[PDB]
Symmetry: C2
Subunit: 288 residues, 2 copies
């Protein structure tokens, strides 16, 4: 019944910049076959911020027509208005998505817990009676919006069955450990690989993982089975030298032989040939 | 020249919906009191908090009420090429004077090359209709600085498409370089300390939050290039609080319209004590 392992699925682009939907679906099927319980579309690693509001509708519809069960799909929602967050969430939930991965709004800076509580509440009200299965996304290194333990408690208390978990990508164990003690009744999912297995052993329900795009079984052992893997921790450090999402895509290409993954959407830029060789070398030293 | 545009505040009802009547009346007041245009859905307008459907209804309502499209600028503050192009094309097709286009603001620490590619892709997607884009440099909010070099690249590649820059950095050495290197474009200045000086150096005006409640005073800076230390001193005061909620406090104070108090989450309304402080600071300078 736990959340388990979800791939933070990468989004492949053709040379003309459009989404390669067949390649995307095939990659999802591979990740599911290799140990993911679900795939998360349009998250950070998916460049979801860069995927249009019409594109995401086309992609979700195509995934469902291709026969991937909606209950094996999580959709990231990374927008700044109540209306758009509710609309995107409602559409995915109506389609049968397992969960929404909902970021707080990320335009205004230095926002208060009270402001955030009110925003989430307004989104949930706007979704309406069908609201369910929202995982709130704590990724302050990207959004510059922390979801405090206290805020998570306020949300859980007010919205039982609606706020069902937290994706904690803070890399702040002092925070994560409190999420587990106070809110481990929810699905507490852990972004920082060094504390993933540790957190699973303390009741964490898994991960929405970028590395799981190319080391699925290895991440599953951590996220589901609660087993450490120092090689994964080391890989993530070795890759700090490079933009995270473009480097993950380089390793999808390296492990699969699929050249499509090279390409990223602006405002990201391609990893250079020399830097790709460094990334592949770091991977090979650990896993090949 | 561009002149003075109000960075128009967006009024909300107690139930949270947009008070479109109050918004249009406020725009007419700002226009009548010295704005050449009004900018909808910018930072001061809480544009990030205005939904993709709401903005369409608001823009249609403005135009149906008889506000000239050539006196409307629309902020576009999204992170995807498709949505930036869709929103921009819609406003341009409706006859908006300009788009105020922010760079995407989810990913952090992005490169000039990535930004050039993003803007280029937006403009290609809009197509031949693309015109009158003001690129928005507000790094204190977006965490994305538009460098002088990037502005040059955009101007060179997209003449008539990239027609200006709204520089809200408050970084004079930056602004001064924009003016000196790219003053052939409409360089508009957000920092009040810098507005009149920049206008004297060839700046074309401002999209101004303070112009919601001190329109004539900002016009003398933005159009006539005259320093006003009172405005600078007031901005020092407004920067002690979340800026947009504090601006709204002063729209309420100067107009007697209570509606402006309310802000949309994730903002929170200014407290009664802080409101009296802001009003007192204003009164000490302007009343
Ligand atoms: Mg955004």
């Amino acid at each position: 019944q736990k959340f388990g392992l979800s791939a933070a699925l990468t989004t492949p682009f053709k040379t003309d910049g459009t989404v390669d939907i067949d390649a995307m679906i095939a990659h999802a099927r591979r990740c599911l076959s290799n140990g993911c319980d679900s795939v998360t579309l349009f998250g950070t690693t998916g460049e979801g911020c860069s995927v249009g509001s019409r594109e995401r509708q086309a992609i979700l519809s195509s995934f469902i027509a291709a026969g991937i069960a909606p209950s094996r799909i999580v959709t990231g929602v990374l927008v700044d208005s109540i209306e758009d967050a509710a609309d995107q969430s409602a559409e995915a939930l109506n389609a049968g998505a397992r969960n929404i991965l909902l970021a707080p709004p990320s335009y205004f800076k230095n926002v208060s817990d009270d402001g955030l509580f009110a925003w989430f509440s307004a989104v949930f009200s706007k979704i309406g009676k069908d609201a369910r299965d929202i995982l709130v996304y704590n990724i302050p290194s990207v959004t510059m919006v922390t979801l405090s333990v206290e805020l998570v408690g306020r949300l859980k208390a007010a919205f039982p069955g609606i706020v069902t978990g937290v994706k904690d990508s803070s890399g702040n164990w002092s925070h994560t450990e409190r999420l587990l003690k106070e809110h481990g009744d929810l699905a507490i999912l852990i972004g920082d690989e060094r504390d993933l297995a540790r957190g699973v052993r303390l009741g964490g329900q898994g991960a929405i993982s970028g590395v799981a795009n190319f080391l699925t079984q290895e991440v599953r052992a951590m996220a589901v089975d609660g087993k450490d893997d120092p090689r994964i921790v080391d890989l993530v450090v070795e890759l700090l030298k490079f933009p995270v999402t473009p480097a993950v895509k380089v390793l999808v290409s390296h492990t699969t032989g699929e050249t499509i993954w090279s390409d990223v959407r602006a405002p990201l830029v391609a990893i250079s040939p020399e830097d790709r060789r460094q990334i592949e070398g770091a991977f090979d030293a650990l896993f090949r």
